[PDB]
Design a protein around this ligand. Sequence first.
Ligand SMILES: NC(=O)C[C@H](N)C(=O)O
Ligand SMILES: NC(=O)C[C@H](N)C(=O)O
Ligand SMILES: NC(=O)C[C@H](N)C(=O)O
Ligand SMILES: NC(=O)C[C@H](N)C(=O)O
Lengths: 326, 314, 314, 326
Amino acid sequence: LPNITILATGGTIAGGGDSATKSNYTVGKVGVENLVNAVPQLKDIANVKGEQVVNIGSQDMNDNVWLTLAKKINTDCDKTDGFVITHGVDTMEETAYFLDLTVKCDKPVVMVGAMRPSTSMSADGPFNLYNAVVTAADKASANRGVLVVMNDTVLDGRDVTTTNTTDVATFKSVNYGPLGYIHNGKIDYQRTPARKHTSDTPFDVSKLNELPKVGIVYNYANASDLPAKALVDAGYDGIVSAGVGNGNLYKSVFDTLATAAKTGTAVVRSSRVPTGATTQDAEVDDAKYGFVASGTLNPQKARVLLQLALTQTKDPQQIQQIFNQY
Amino acid sequence: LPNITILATGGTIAGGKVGVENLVNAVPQLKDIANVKGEQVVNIGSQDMNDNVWLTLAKKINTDCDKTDGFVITHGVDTMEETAYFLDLTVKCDKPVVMVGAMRPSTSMSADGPFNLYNAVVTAADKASANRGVLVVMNDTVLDGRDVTTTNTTDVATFKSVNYGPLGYIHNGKIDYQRTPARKHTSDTPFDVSKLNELPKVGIVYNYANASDLPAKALVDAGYDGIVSAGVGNGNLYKSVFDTLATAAKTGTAVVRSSRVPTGATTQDAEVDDAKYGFVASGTLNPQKARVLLQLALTQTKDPQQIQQIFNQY
Amino acid sequence: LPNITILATGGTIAGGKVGVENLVNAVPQLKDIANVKGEQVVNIGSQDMNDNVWLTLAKKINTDCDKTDGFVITHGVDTMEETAYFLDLTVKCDKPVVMVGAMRPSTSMSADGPFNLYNAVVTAADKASANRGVLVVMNDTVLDGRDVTTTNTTDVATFKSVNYGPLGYIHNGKIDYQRTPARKHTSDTPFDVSKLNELPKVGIVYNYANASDLPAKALVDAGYDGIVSAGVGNGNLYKSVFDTLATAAKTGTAVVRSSRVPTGATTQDAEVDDAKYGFVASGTLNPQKARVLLQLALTQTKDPQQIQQIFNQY
Amino acid sequence: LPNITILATGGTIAGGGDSATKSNYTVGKVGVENLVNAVPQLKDIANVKGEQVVNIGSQDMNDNVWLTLAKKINTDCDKTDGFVITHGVDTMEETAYFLDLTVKCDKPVVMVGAMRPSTSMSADGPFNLYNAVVTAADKASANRGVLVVMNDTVLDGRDVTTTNTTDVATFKSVNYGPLGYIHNGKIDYQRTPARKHTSDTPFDVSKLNELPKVGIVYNYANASDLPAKALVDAGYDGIVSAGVGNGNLYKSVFDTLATAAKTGTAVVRSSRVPTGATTQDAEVDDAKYGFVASGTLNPQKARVLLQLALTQTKDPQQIQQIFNQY
Ligand SMILES: NC(=O)C[C@H](N)C(=O)O
Ligand SMILES: NC(=O)C[C@H](N)C(=O)O
Ligand SMILES: NC(=O)C[C@H](N)C(=O)O
Ligand SMILES: NC(=O)C[C@H](N)C(=O)O
């Protein structure tokens, strides 16, 4: 039986409320031991060791917790057969991707959460955790990058996103689909991400105490340029536009970001549209403005890759190539 | 044959550089189904859509309701969902208003605009289309203005009512309607923009890991009437954004929680005590749609309980 | 507190080997929302669901309408969509009938049955749930019986109204309803099974490349009342199946074209001249749902024009 | 500029009606020359050569047309840089998979169709054909098995299915998602199928003049066993069950197929449910009955693979391993 290390960060998976049938709960409240012991069947499939890294709602996830997770996995790689990270849903898609690009360990890292607290009727957490361990324990799960496991499905860290505010089925890889489905503790993998990840990336956070500052501005009809200006005035290293349609920008926001791109701020166009690439060669001449197109990376995922890109380079043509490879 | 007025605003259906009369002329079969008259309102990319154009459309439809049997509005894709809901809430006319656009310009191969426009006229001309609110007609599908949204950056099939589904499907120039929106719309709303030349200022701040509070604070510093939060999961906020908006809500700004998540309601009774913070939960309204309703709510009340009631009825 | 009757039929929610009283006792919070009484009708895998059980359910609900405030039916997943539509068309009771099942048994980890049952009771107890036809409640979603279908072999979120969307979503024990089925149902249909001990024989044949005609011919040889074709694309037929069913339609068998394709209507005015062949086009009804309506149509008429009318109204 | 060979079989892509704005049409009517000449932009990207193989509605697709396509592609492999097959929508998913398992040629084979006839307003055919040639022309398209290209998307032959009766967007890979999206005549591939295809399969139809007889029976409430019996009585080689839920069968149908499996007929359980695997280890003890579970293969696809399996073997355990590998 493999050795599996659960790194706990909080989330609703570790959350509780007063009633099995009322929606009110709080988060990252129960400890890693409690979760494990709630799933005795884990003994059938793994020797599980739990460690509490933080205990927070993933709505409060942040760069320092990402640094700690990356360093820890890379540090402790030799001591275990794989990692499960228990985490809230809200920003799982971000942390997954950060880890997808910064872990160098060749053992599976599988992230997991729940939409219902442990106390709720038909809570999803227990089986989700079980399945995350199955996955981390499967030899065939290696060399697929960092994963998320929810609702019987194995998802790659890059494409995976939450699609619904409440559904147990929220996590989908919305552009290229899942890697594998889980049934009866076994996985039939039929896909692997082609974009470079983990040890094929140049990103190394081992000696980083902070990450480049990147903020996200939303576009909409009659959008204020004040948010963008505020990030410019603060000397942000980069800005991601949550564009409309195929990464389009309101004229005010466009004008502000075009000025900033000239001064040296990195500007990535992404889109608020939930599926599909923000493309080159549509309505915005990126080359002319010095902007980068995000491809299928949603704004928050684009921020993740931009911060990491910014650790290697400030040159927009090089940042674009990074956005084309990872 | 019914009389249908086409109000043109631009968009890639018009690529917005072609005039309304050119668009009509390009689809001669429109005369088989309506007597079409075209008026140019503006001619822009909808990524530059704004409050002034919104007010102009609403007033025009309301003023000209009696001179026609139905309206089609040619518009860009990118913010179609925003204009549609705004008109859903402010048009007082009982006659069909159908918005339409295109993902490809009419010079591209297999250009979608011509048949899209045809179907939008079919819809606007169909008796059965009245009393269903403002509609968007794309890819053979009639969609209500409240729920409709663009789901893909490039797909001709992008427009979807992602929470509650379409109203009807169009085949061979006819619609089988099986659904109508229950939320109150058009003449059942109190919003009346007939005399307004501007709208309350409402901005949208995004949430993500490690989010800066600076965008929220910049809207507060400018005295924005309202701030919508594109929250994470079920409308949650990064702590520094939460702190900023908690202050704002008790200091003369209305604050709506919505979600960056593409489907599902931002609910009450989850992790945020909205009553405690003076916040309004947006339900199924996404950030940009929530902004629309907030702006219009603020024409009526600054009372956050009354704003929430509005968000529970429209 | 309303009185709710649970009619049990089996399914994996009962894994069907557990009794109704066991299922009720397993969710004590049901008493917070209703006075629940359980009756066992049968206890089977819904893959063995049949005409006799359908008739029993319909008669029971119709007979007992006045003794209760609402019904929940515990049922298997696999043919839930079929039983739901049958009851959608034959129940005459004005009170909510809500069907429910589970993908995982009670003993399995994160078993879905208990909360599913809770929610189905919430639904059946809600005033607002009346007059919406027969409902299926799964994964926090209220779905009409006409459009609902299972979309995945194992996913707890499998149940979806794939053409027209859900009616409402359930959060914290309350439903925000935004939709109601337009097709006529329950007391607005003519179908009355009160006196029937059997139904017209209706079978289904599949289409694919190189399809044999032998299945179709075997139902014709048995004198079946009707055949539904699970067509390819927009309800098309493989030539040898087409030839067989063309004969059957003029030789005393009713023939409905539906589609193996999971969404979208089988339409008239595409590649098959239904009037020429004496065929009926199923619309959005999938093959198993088309069978339901055909059987019930054949209790009223064998005239294929009247059958098509029925298919255009229910 | 690459040499690309279009093999035309008919379909609505080659169909026409009297009105641009009415739904009535007939199929497989226009010739390959007309289609090509309707898309002059193809000269920008390829030297296209057309040949008419058949001109039929894909609703009448059949084994002999499959054999002719496979042999032809295998025969003519050395003479061209890749193949586009113009084909109806209705059974494209079947022909695609057959070809996915029997083509041995290492050049791209890309299938394509249209939901609207050429005569219709906003007809989808032209750009569809263009994009099919782009794909067949792209070096990076090789070694991915047989493809389908519709609505700007590149799809693998195995998972691809039609999901709606009329929508231009119908074609989706519903379990594992697409391989690549096309924009501005370029593809960003991020996936490739893991199941064995083309030259990695043992199936060789070069000398076959017919295929093993395999029929499909549907399950539903009160299902008749007469269809299944009729295929048994005719000595069919195999039978595919379009099962309910996770490949379950009505008792009558179950009893008939269980008897047949004992006599030597190959029985594959599939499902009428549009997504997800028909699994082992659920309600049916396949080993006990001698049945084969189809995995994510829909009934029509399962038939394609069962016919080909039957060319190598009649042994259920071997057929199961084929269903686990291809
Ligand atoms: N269901 C969840 O886990 C949501 C929670 N707010 C989180 O992200 O921590
Ligand atoms: N396809 C389109 O219409 C996009 C364009 N930018 C618009 O929204 O005006
Ligand atoms: N999950 C289930 O209920 C499946 C079971 N075979 C049934 O339909 O009865
Ligand atoms: N759209 C199409 O091509 C449908 C046609 N019946 C076919 O499959 O040939």
